[PDB]
């Protein structure tokens, strides 16, 4: 609830975003510079925004509050923005690559009429204001740099995991055989937990002169098993979670994905039961997503997910008591009660 | 033929680029790692390279010839490929947005069987390949931020562009009066001018320690007017020029691309003509493209384009003249002999 307590300033400060990504006024570009705020307003808006509270979060748990003045606090609400648009040109072109319908309770930007693969440009102006924000705001301080290459190894990593994602996942042919946990794991820690975990608060820490390797190795240890069980936990919702809370409709298993479910579901499966998937699997019917479903539930896979929480909440409370140390417990607490 | 002659270096570069990008050998990503191989491999090679040893060239004459060592040349040519990566990069994506068919003497990435909307992905990565290549080369080079800043600020310039290209070309829809020479030229300075020859030029620059902004300010005005001229001819090319040369087969007209040749057509059309477009510009059909040929060719804008050229030479020449100084002239003309 620190983050309910940061969060009112930090979405108010998005009208501040935009005005300044528009103030490029070379009259030439207005055109453009005018689709840009419909994206940005359309797709950087209706989410929970934790990621970007996450930077918000932590710079004040972080820095010294003599050293938290308007200005430094300023960038780190622009920071906060920074990483949800990441979040936003990488959803608006999965959302693309993976059909989807519809994103945070409206149908997906590229959907629209009048848009379609034009999405794929709207979704790299997105990420380019990135850098123009950090340009604006942070050019003249230390940690400028550091930011730089930490979105942008950040955005290499998660693309990276993409691709494992995407060549795990043909389309159109059956495969089974390469759902192992292994692989699982390897996706959602390059797709997932560095640029939803170990970023924001790699960020905060770099804004707080906080640069040290070994310091940054101890967060990431932390924040990678956050970020695996936070896929998971997305994975299991995407077939089981409530639209009107996730926003999205789910299309892992028509997507043919390697998800935490069909990964278990192999686990458990008896050969009848291997068929069943075999036959309904990575298909776009619904009554074949339907029988999966019913496999799924067949066995008790909603109640191995409740377990697994458990489990990986409690070694998660473990990691932070081994790792959190020299920085605030609270960073990571926070995070944890955000999404246990 | 500066060109010619630092070519075949830059090319077999090409292996050590890979093996780089490569050896970031995390076992787990492997796979990815050689989709990514694949994906270098299919769409940064079969093209001209004249961005990438621009690049070279520039560098070999604005660089003091005893401090062009072995490291600070393989260098240059690592800074090269980074530009030839951008190209790629939005090569793969705007092919994808365009509809295309074929590209550089081979069936378009996306359209090959497997590939798809996946192409998005591997796009992006392909433009994360700059930043990874500027940091192994160039990190502790002063001018690293220089780069780093530059090649974005680039990257953006150029989707506004895009932006500002894909909007006055709405799809399904009539509207000349959209295509205006003053957009048309806002139009490529943006999607084309920055990219293709500030970049390159002011990449070296900065290589060189040319970063003063009075000196950057002077190339441009020669680049972006080169710039210009460059996008107007590969235009003209895209209806007549000789697909064994280009490369691809052009779709403007019935992608209902704001065109030179449109443009000049709509200053020199009749209320007949200007019907006849009407009704054929903008569409799938080969006998409505076909139509609009004849139109353009009924109104001899091949010799309107041919006398355009003589003139832009002859400007380019001029500011040349102008703003080339304190920078060897011959900077700017190996790129002008290279273009006209
Ligand atoms: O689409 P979402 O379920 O929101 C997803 O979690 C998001 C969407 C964008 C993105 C990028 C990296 N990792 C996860 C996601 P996905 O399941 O596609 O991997
Ligand atoms: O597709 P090409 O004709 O090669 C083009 O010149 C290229 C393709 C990628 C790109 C990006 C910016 N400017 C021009 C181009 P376009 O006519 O699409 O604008
Ligand atoms: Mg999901
Ligand atoms: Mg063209």
Redesign the interface.
């Known amino acids: 609830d620190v983050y309910a307590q940061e969060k009112q300033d930090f979405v108010q400060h998005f009208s501040q975003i935009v005005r300044v990504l528009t103030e490029d006024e070379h009259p030439?570009?207005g055109?453009?510079?005018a689709?840009?705020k419909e994206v940005l307003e359309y797709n950087a808006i209706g989410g929970k925004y934790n990621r970007g509270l996450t930077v918000v979060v932590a710079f004040r748990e972080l820095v010294e509050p003599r050293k938290q003045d308007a200005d430094s606090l300023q960038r780190a609400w622009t920071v906060g923005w920074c990483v949800e648009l990441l979040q936003a040109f990488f959803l608006v072109?999965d959302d693309?690559?993976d059909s989807s319908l519809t994103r945070r309770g409206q149908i997906c930007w590229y959907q629209k009429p009048?848009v379609?693969?034009?999405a794929?440009?709207?979704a790299?102006?997105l990420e380019?204001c990135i850098?123009?924000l950090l340009?604006l705001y942070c050019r003249e301080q230390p940690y400028?740099?550091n930011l730089?290459?930490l979105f942008?190894?950040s955005?290499?990593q998660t693309?990276?995991?993409?691709?494992?994602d995407?060549?795990t996942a043909?389309?159109g042919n059956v495969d089974l055989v390469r759902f192992t946990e292994?692989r699982y794991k390897?996706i959602v820690?390059?797709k997932t937990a560095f640029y939803s975990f170990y970023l924001p608060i790699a960020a905060a820490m770099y804004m707080a002169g906080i640069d040290g390797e070994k310091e940054h190795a101890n967060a990431k240890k932390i924040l990678l098993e956050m970020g695996e069980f936070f896929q998971i936990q997305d994975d299991y919702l995407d077939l089981f979670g409530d639209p009107s809370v996730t926003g999205k409709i789910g299309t892992d298993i028509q997507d043919n994905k390697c998800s935490w479910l069909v990964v278990q579901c192999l686990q458990r499966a008896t050969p009848e039961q291997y068929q069943i998937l075999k036959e309904n699997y990575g298909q776009k019917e619904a009554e074949k997503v339907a029988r999966v479903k019913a496999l799924y539930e067949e066995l008790d896979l909603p109640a191995v997910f409740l377990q697994y929480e458990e489990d990986s909440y409690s070694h998660i409370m473990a990691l932070i008591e081994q790792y959190a140390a020299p920085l605030p417990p609270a960073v990571f607490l926070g995070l944890a009660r955000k999404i246990y």
Do not use: F, V, W
């Open positions: 030439e570009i055109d453009a510079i689709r840009l072109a693309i690559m009048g379609g693969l034009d794929i440009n709207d790299n102006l380019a850098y123009r340009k400028y740099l730089i290459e942008l190894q955005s290499y693309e990276i995991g993409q691709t494992l995407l060549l043909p389309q292994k390897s820690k390059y």
